[PDB]
Amino acid sequence: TKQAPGVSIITAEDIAKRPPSNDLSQIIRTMPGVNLTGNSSSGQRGNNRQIDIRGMGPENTLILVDGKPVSSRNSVRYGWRGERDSRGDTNWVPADQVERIEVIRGPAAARYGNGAAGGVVNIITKQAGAETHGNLSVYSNFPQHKAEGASERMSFGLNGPLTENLSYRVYGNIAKTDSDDWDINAGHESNRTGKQAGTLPAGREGVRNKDIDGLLSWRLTPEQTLEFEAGFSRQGNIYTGDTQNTNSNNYVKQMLGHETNRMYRETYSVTHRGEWDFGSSLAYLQYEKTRNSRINEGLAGGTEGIFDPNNAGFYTATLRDLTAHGEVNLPLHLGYEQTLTLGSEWTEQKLDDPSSNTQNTEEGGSIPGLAGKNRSSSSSARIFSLFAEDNIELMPGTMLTPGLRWDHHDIVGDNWSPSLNLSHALTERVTLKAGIARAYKAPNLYQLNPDYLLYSRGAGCYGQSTSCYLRGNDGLKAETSVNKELGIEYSHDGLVAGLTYFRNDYKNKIESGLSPVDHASGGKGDYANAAIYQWENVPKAVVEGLEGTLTLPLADGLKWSNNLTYMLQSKNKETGDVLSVTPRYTLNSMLDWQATDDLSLQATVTWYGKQKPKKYDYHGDRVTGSANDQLSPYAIAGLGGTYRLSKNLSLGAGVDNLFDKRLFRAGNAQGVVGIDGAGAATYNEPGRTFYTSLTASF
Ligand SMILES: O=C(N[C@H]1COC(=O)[C@@H](NC(=O)c2cccc(O)c2O)COC(=O)[C@@H](NC(=O)c2cccc(O)c2O)COC1=O)c1cccc(O)c1O
Ligand SMILES: [Fe+3]
Numbered sequence: 016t017k018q019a020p021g022v023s024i025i026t027a028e029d030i031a032k033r034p035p036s037n038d039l040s041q042i043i044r045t046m047p048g049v050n051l052t053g054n055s056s057s058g059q060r061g062n063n064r065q066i067d068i069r070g071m072g073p074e075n076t077l078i079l080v081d082g083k084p085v086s087s088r089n090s091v092r093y094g095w096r097g098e099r100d101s102r103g104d105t106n107w108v109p110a111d112q113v114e115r116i117e118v119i120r121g122p123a124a125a126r127y128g129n130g131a132a133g134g135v136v137n138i139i140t141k142q143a144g145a146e147t148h149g150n151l152s153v154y155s156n157f158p159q160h161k162a163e164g165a166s167e168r169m170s171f172g173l174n175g176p177l178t179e180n181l182s183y184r185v186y187g188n189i190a191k192t193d194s195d196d197w198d199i200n201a202g203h204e205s206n207r208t209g210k211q212a213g214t215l216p217a218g219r220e221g222v223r224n225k226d227i228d229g230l231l232s233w234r235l236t237p238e239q240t241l242e243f244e245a246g247f248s249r250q251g252n253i254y255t256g257d258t259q260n261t262n263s264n265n266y267v268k269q270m271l272g273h274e275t276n277r278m279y280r281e282t283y284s285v286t287h288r289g290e291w292d293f294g295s296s297l298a299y300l301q302y303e304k305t306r307n308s309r310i311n312e313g314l315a316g317g318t319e320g321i322f323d324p325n326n327a328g329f330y331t332a333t334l335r336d337l338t339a340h341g342e343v344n345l346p347l348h349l350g351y352e353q354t355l356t357l358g359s360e361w362t363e364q365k366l367d368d369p370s371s372n373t374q375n376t377e378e379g380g381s382i383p384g385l386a387g388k389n390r391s392s393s394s395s396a397r398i399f400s401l402f403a404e405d406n407i408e409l410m411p412g413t414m415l416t417p418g419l420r421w422d423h424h425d426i427v428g429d430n431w432s433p434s435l436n437l438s439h440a441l442t443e444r445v446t447l448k449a450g451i452a453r454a455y456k457a458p459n460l461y462q463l464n465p466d467y468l469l470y471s472r473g474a475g476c477y478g479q480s481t482s483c484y485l486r487g488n489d490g491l492k493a494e495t496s497v498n499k500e501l502g503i504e505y506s507h508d509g510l511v512a513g514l515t516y517f518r519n520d521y522k523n524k525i526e527s528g529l530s531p532v533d534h535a536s537g538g539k540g541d542y543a544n545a546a547i548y549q550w551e552n553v554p555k556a557v558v559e560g561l562e563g564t565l566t567l568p569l570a571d572g573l574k575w576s577n578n579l580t581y582m583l584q585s586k587n588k589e590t591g592d593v594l595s596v597t598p599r600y601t602l603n604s605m606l607d608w609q610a611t612d613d614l615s616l617q618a619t620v621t622w623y624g625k626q627k628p629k630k631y632d633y634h635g636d637r638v639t640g641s642a643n644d645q646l647s648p649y650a651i652a653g654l655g656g657t658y659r660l661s662k663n664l665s666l667g668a669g670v671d672n673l674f675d676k677r678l679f680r681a682g683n684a685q686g687v688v689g690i691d692g693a694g695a696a697t698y699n700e701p702g703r704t705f706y707t708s709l710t711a712s713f
Contacts, residue, residue, distance in 0.1 A: 040064070050580065057629075060259065070594060077134070123436055147175025167190065182234075185228065194255040211688075219701075251276070259320025267321065278305060314371070314374040358403070360402070361399055420432040424493065458493065482546070494522065511565065519559075529635070557584055558582075573607070599648075603619070620650055644694030651671075664710070
């Protein structure tokens with residue numbers, strides 16, 4: 016099965032029958048437990064949604080490629096409301112070179128450590144064979160409404176042997192998703208008056224991709240393998256008017272249709288793999304270098320996250336991320352039969368950002384200990400980590416898996432993340448699973464940095480109208496979460512029925528603070544002597560929900576599958592507001608008809624439940640009017656198919672959103688001056704869209 020309790024596999028076959036436009040989030044999000052959301056509740060950058068596991072936010076979803084971390088979004092400014100203007104990190108590997116995807120949710124993910132408090136998504140690539148193989152994949156879609164951006168995608172792969180002990184695989188992808196038209200939300204925008212009249216919330220950003228990966232596998236002995244791989248990728252956007260607050264100016268408009276951010280991502284990795292008598296061994300060194308070049312934005316008030324016209328032009332933020340990992344695996348023959356794993360891990364994150372730390376203090380007054388001009392660009396953190404797993408067979412069919420992970424973060428201090436995972440055959444058809452772990456979150460380098468400084472004259476300040484600063488805070492604690500799950504699954508002859516309950520108790524969630532810690536001195540007029548807030552740890556928050564699956568084989572050629580997410584709770588227990596905005600439930604339904612040996616056909620439905628916006632504004636006050644708007648439940652249906660022409664050639668074709676259900680971003684969630692709020696209506700849902708596809712492979 017592709018769904019056990021806590022875990023989902025997506026195969027290459029699934030990727031082909033629900034072909035993604037471009038980013039994998041599209042298909043990853045259809046698993047149980049998984050949503051596609053922003054990180055907090057502002058609605059800012061709300062068309063830039065990313066994979067969210069059990070409502071824990073997408074910063075707590077750790078993305079791996081072939082077991083190796085992706086850190087690139089940590090190169091984008093982390094803003095006052097916990098969003099980055101980033102597309103996330105699931106669009107680095109092209110869909111057609113993926114062998115499979117693993118999604119691991121809650122207690123089974125905490126053993127991976129930093130940033131897995133929601134879970135892990137591990138994107139696995141196809142590997143070289145016994146003979147030389149390769150493929151050519153093309154995809155092209157066609158929206159009904161021309162406003163919306165079409166997508167085109169071309170990718171190859173090519174792999175095989177060279178000597179008897181030498182293998183290679185390479186692939187390369189070129190793709191484009193056109194942006195939505197700059198005006199796509201016209202007539203649907205929130206009410207905009209005075210200076211802000213005419214402003215627009217934006218449609219989906221476009222992107223251009225170039226990815227090129229090369230790998231050599233060398234197995235210098237029967238027991239010993241050595242891999243070298245390098246990746247070069249580049250995403251450049253197509254800008255369509257998006258700004259943090261939905262305000263506009265002339266620089267914004269000048270840039271409509273142009274590249275305004277480009278991310279270059281380079282990865283190099285050496286991996287040694289060892290298999291002998293006492294068991295298995297594995298170690299790797301990865302260097303990820305991310306360059307994030309974008310137009311300078313402002314860092315104050317309504318000017319936070321809009322192109323700054325006084326400082327026109329590009330800056331480049333640089334992320335050097337360094338990862339090395341070691342492990343061994345020992346079968347142990349003892350009074351209980353078992354498997355032991357011992358490992359270290361070391362990472363370094365260097366961040367150079369010459370832009371984010373440049374807000375100055377001439378208006379709100381200055382801040383003792385913080386220079387107003389030429390603050391450092393630099394941040395870094397190292398975590399060292401040790402861990403051990405034991406995989407214990409109590410009695411055949413029953414497994415107990417304890418592990419301990421310890422992490423030393425060189426600023427925040429020591430973390431202890433223990434875990435315990437149980438599975439139990441109760442019957443030959445029924446299996447009970449339980450897991451309880453404490454997962455780990457390192458503050459990001461923006462939260463942590465006393466030189467990172469934002470400003471507002473009042474509207475964004477919690478509990479007051481005066482000017483205020485927000486400041487990074489090196490005193491911060493790590494976020495930890497006690498992720499519980501209890502689940503039960505019937506499985507027999509492709510009949511599958513399972514239901515899991517999960518609760519994550521969430522401690523020290525980091526977030527812009529509520530009380531001033533101090534006041535600056537000096538500055539101009541009514542803004543002088545502004546209040547100073549920091550990034551704080553929220554003492555307690557909770558998420559809670561249900562994951563279900565049901566799979567029935569209607570007849571031989573024909574399979575009916577369903578995945579269910581239901582979100583019971585999502586609560587900042589300090590403020591009482593919600594953490595993320597999710598749909599109350601999500602049901603995904605596929606019917607799969609294997610009509611002939613050669614022709615497969617697929618119908619799908621997704622039902623999304625209601626969605627509620629935040630209740631409180633940036634002041635902490637209760638919102639009014641269109642800031643309260645909710646999104647009603649809706650469903651999206653789709654048909655597609657794949658017709659095999661030969662061993663060497665298949666064709667695909669279908670329609671996403673059969674019934675043309677469309678939604679439109681009206682703005683951000685709350686009122687500001689001149690720009691009424693849009694509540695939960697913060698994203699654009701695309702309409703009917705035809706697509707075709709073609710895959711040739713030897
Ligand atoms: O969405 C927000 N703005 C909107 C809506 O607010 C406004 O348009 C006005 N605004 C206030 O009167 C205000 C009254 C009382 C208190 C204020 O802070 C006001 O701004 C004017 O400000 C501006 O025109 C611009 N703005 C600055 O230059 C600025 C420069 C330095 C410092 C600033 O604070 C600035 O606004 C752009 O502002 C906007 O478009 C918004 C969000 C989050 C936090 C904010 O502070 C926002 O203002
Ligand atoms: Fe302001």
